[PDB]
Amino acid sequence: AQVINTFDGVADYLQTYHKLPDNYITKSEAQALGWVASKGNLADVAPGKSIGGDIFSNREGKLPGKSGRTWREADINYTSGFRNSDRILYSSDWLIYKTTDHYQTFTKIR
Amino acid sequence: KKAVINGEQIRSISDLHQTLKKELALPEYYGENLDALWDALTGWVEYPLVLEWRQFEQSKQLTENGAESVLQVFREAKAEGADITIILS
């Protein structure tokens, strides 16, 4: 399988190609294929895929909001089983940030 | 399944986050904030989920009316297709 899943790996791809790697499907697309989250079964129904691409609403306003700018997010460092706490966050105007603590703090990395 | 939030004992917004955690058997890494509850609700939690929030207006004043925005996240989650029943007692 074709996998790109690290903070630098996905960050550089988003900057260069303005698109997420192909190993990412949204929650919705995954739910359709048979993913039920509490079973921790992403790898059985979508091997090689990670959750990524979904809109991030930036509910605690920790990230720079501005009119016209949408945020989105994706899982980093996932292979199998239950999801972890690492995420990348990218904007429509390509700001990139990351979190390793299940969204408590966010670091700008590009 | 059946989780009961008593809005009398909800001292603060952190109090709430700890209760949601033990009551919905949220991840040990849980970030205790709204972005984190959204992800736990759309990507961790077992369904069907039925949430009973007793005594919501008390909850609101105590939580400087921030209980409303965590009520909004369960509604949004439910509009996305999550099997959540909210019972405002």
DSSP states of A51-79 as a string? Answer: EEEEEE--TT--S---TT--EEEEE-S--
A1-110, CATH topology level: Nuclear Transport Factor 2; Chain: A, (3.10.450)
* Residue ranges covered by each domain of chain A: 1-110
Cα separation of B64 and A16, whole Å? 44
Closest CA to A96 of A4, A3, A5, A12: A12
In this structure, the number of other CB atoms found within 10 A of the CB of residue A15 comes to 12
Of the candidates A31, A38, A103, the beta carbon closest to that of B35 is on A103
Q: Tokens in use for A30?
A: 């995954």
Cα separation of A25 and B31, whole Å? 23
- DSSP string for A3-38: ---SHHHHHHHHHHHSS--TTEE-HHHHHHHT--GG
In this structure, the number of other CB atoms found within 10 A of the CB of residue A96 comes to 18
Query: Which candidate in B34, B35, B45, B84 is best for mutational testing of the A interface (most A CBs within 10 A)?
Result: B35
CATH number of the domain residue B29 falls in: 3.30.370.10
Cα separation of A83 and A96, whole Å? 21
Of the candidates B30, B73, B81, the beta carbon closest to that of A102 is on B30
List of residues 6+ apart from B64 with CB closer than 8 A: B13
Cα separation of B36 and B26, whole Å? 10
List of residues 6+ apart from A10 with CB closer than 8 A: A4, A20, A21, A52, A74, A76, A88
Cα separation of A104 and B13, whole Å? 15
Q: Tokens in use for B63?
A: 């939580």
Angle between helices B67-79 and B34-43 (to 10 degrees): 30
Q: Counting every residue, how long is chain A?
A: 110
A18 has catalytic annotation? no
Number of domains into which chain B is organized: 1
Resolution of the structure in the document, Å: 2.6
Per the entry, the structure determination technique was X-ray
Burial class (CB in 10 A: 0-12, 13-18, 19+), B69: middle
Cα separation of A77 and A99, whole Å? 12
Contact B51, B45 (CB under 8 A): no
User: By residue range, what is the domain housing residue B80?
Assistant: 1-89
Cα separation of B81 and A25, whole Å? 17
